[PDB]
Design an enzyme around this catalytic site. Structure first.
Site, short mmCIF file in Angstrom:
data_model
loop_
_atom_site.label_atom_id
_atom_site.label_comp_id
_atom_site.label_asym_id
_atom_site.label_seq_id
_atom_site.Cartn_x
_atom_site.Cartn_y
_atom_site.Cartn_z
N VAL A 233 30.82 -40.51 23.24
CA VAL A 233 32.07 -41.65 22.79
C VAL A 233 33.00 -40.58 22.75
O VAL A 233 33.49 -39.49 22.55
CB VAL A 233 30.84 -41.46 21.21
N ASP B 135 15.97 -21.35 19.28
CA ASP B 135 16.99 -20.77 21.23
C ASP B 135 18.35 -21.67 21.40
O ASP B 135 18.09 -22.81 21.08
CB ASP B 135 15.45 -20.71 21.41
N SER B 136 18.76 -21.34 22.58
CA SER B 136 19.06 -22.55 23.60
C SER B 136 18.21 -22.60 24.22
O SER B 136 16.99 -22.72 24.53
CB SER B 136 19.73 -21.00 24.61
N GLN C 39 17.28 -26.32 28.03
CA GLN C 39 17.79 -26.80 29.19
C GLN C 39 19.38 -27.66 28.56
O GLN C 39 19.09 -28.39 27.77
CB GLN C 39 16.91 -27.86 28.88
N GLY C 40 20.33 -27.71 29.16
CA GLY C 40 21.56 -28.32 29.41
C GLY C 40 22.60 -27.34 28.19
O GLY C 40 23.53 -27.79 28.23
N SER D 39 22.75 -24.81 29.42
CA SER D 39 22.91 -23.57 30.41
C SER D 39 24.58 -23.50 30.49
O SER D 39 24.88 -24.19 30.26
CB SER D 39 22.76 -23.38 31.73
N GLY D 40 24.71 -22.29 30.97
CA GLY D 40 26.83 -22.17 31.02
C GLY D 40 27.44 -22.01 29.59
O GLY D 40 28.34 -21.47 30.57
N1 LIG Z 1 13.50 -18.31 26.42
C1 LIG Z 1 13.80 -19.06 26.43
N2 LIG Z 1 13.28 -19.87 24.94
N3 LIG Z 1 14.95 -18.96 26.73
C2 LIG Z 1 16.22 -19.86 26.18
C3 LIG Z 1 16.26 -21.15 27.45
C4 LIG Z 1 17.36 -21.59 27.52
C5 LIG Z 1 18.45 -21.56 29.41
N4 LIG Z 1 19.53 -21.42 29.23
C6 LIG Z 1 18.12 -23.29 30.11
O1 LIG Z 1 19.82 -23.43 29.59
O2 LIG Z 1 17.35 -23.39 30.57
CA LIG Z 2 33.29 -37.45 23.30
#
Ligand SMILES: NC(=[NH2+])NCCC[C@H](N)C(=O)O
Ligand SMILES: [Ca+2]
Ligand SMILES: [Cl-]
Ligand SMILES: [Cl-]
Ligand SMILES: [Cl-]
Length: 223
Positions: free
Chosen positions: A57, A171-172, A174-175, A177-178
Site C-alpha cells: 500500500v 528468528d529472522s 526467508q524474505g 535476507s539483507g
Molecule cells: N537458522 C535460522 N532460522 N536462521 C534464520 C533464517 C533467515 C535467513 N537469513 C533468510 O532470510 O533466509
Molecule cells: Ca507502502
C-alpha cells in the site's frame, strides 16, 4: 521475522525493501545514496524502496529510487555465504527525514550478550508460509561464537555471528535476507542465512558488519 512484533510505521527509518517487481530482500540505508544488503540478494534491475511500512500500500512516506550500481564483496563465496555483503548506490540521493534515515556503521564489533533489533518483511511462520505486508521487528541477543559454531559445525567463519534463541520460536526468516541487525544505534549484522527458521538450536546467521567498515567507506569514497 518469526515470533516478532509489528514494529510500527517508520519506526525503523533505515529499513529499505529491495524490489524487482516484488519485495525480495531487505537492506539498510547508510547514507543518502547507499544501501548495505546481502551479497546473496544480488540481482539486476533493483528498485530501492524507502519509507515503507505496508509494502503493498502507498501510505505517504515512500521514496522509490532505482539503483544505479550494485557491488558485491570482492571475496563473496555464494556456496558458504562468506562475506555476505553488498552495497547498492541509488540513482539519486534520498531525502533524509525522521522516517527515512541512515543508520551508523559500527566503530567496533558488538559482543555476545548485546541486545539487537532485527527487522524485515519475511515469513512469520516457522512451519508453513505467511508473508506480512507491514514491518516486523525482533529483539534478539548476539550469541557466543562457541555456541554459534556448536550449532553449525564447520560453517561459521569470522565474518559471521549468530543471534537469537537456542530454544527457537524467534528468528529472522526467508524474505528478511539483507536487512538490518542494529545494536545500540549501530548496524552490526545483515540477515544472511540459517537452517530453516525459528528451529531449536538453529539460530539466524548474520554477516558481521564491523569486519567490513574499511571496505564500505573505501568503496563509497570512490563510487
Ligand atoms: N537458522 C535460522 N532460522 N536462521 C534464520 C533464517 C533467515 C535467513 N537469513 C533468510 O532470510 O533466509
Ligand atoms: Ca507502502
Ligand atoms: Cl504485534
Ligand atoms: Cl517523501
Ligand atoms: Cl566463544
Amino acid at each position: 521475522i518469526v515470533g516478532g512484533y509489528t514494529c510500527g510505521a517508520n519506526t525503523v527509518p533505515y529499513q529499505v525493501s529491495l524490489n524487482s517487481g516484488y519485495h525480495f530482500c531487505g537492506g539498510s540505508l547508510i547514507n543518502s545514496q547507499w544501501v548495505v544488503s546481502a551479497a546473496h540478494c544480488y540481482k539486476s534491475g533493483i528498485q530501492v524502496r524507502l519509507g515503507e511500512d505496508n509494502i503493498n500500500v502507498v501510505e505517504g512516506n515512500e521514496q522509490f529510487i532505482s539503483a544505479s550500481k550494485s557491488i558485491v564483496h570482492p571475496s563473496y563465496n555464494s556456496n558458504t555465504l562468506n562475506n555476505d555483503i553488498m552495497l547498492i548506490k541509488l540513482k539519486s540521493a534520498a531525502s533524509l527525514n525522521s522516517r527515512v534515515a541512515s543508520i551508523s556503521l559500527p566503530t567496533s564489533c558488538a559482543s555476545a550478550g548485546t541486545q539487537c533489533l532485527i527487522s524485515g518483511w519475511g515469513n512469520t511462520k516457522s512451519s508453513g508460509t505467511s508473508y506480512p505486508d507491514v514491518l516486523k521487528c525482533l529483539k534478539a541477543p548476539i550469541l557466543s561464537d562457541s555456541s554459534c559454531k556448536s550449532a553449525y559445525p564447520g560453517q561459521i567463519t569470522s565474518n559471521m555471528f549468530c543471534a537469537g534463541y537456542l530454544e527457537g520460536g524467534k528468528d529472522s526468516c526467508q524474505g528478511d535476507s539483507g536487512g538490518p541487525v542494529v545494536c545500540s544505534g549501530k548496524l552490526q549484522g545483515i540477515v544472511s542465512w540459517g537452517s530453516g527458521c525459528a528451529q531449536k538450536n538453529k539460530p539466524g546467521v548474520y554477516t558481521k558488519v564491523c569486519n567490513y567498515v574499511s571496505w564500505i567507506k573505501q568503496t563509497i569514497a570512490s563510487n
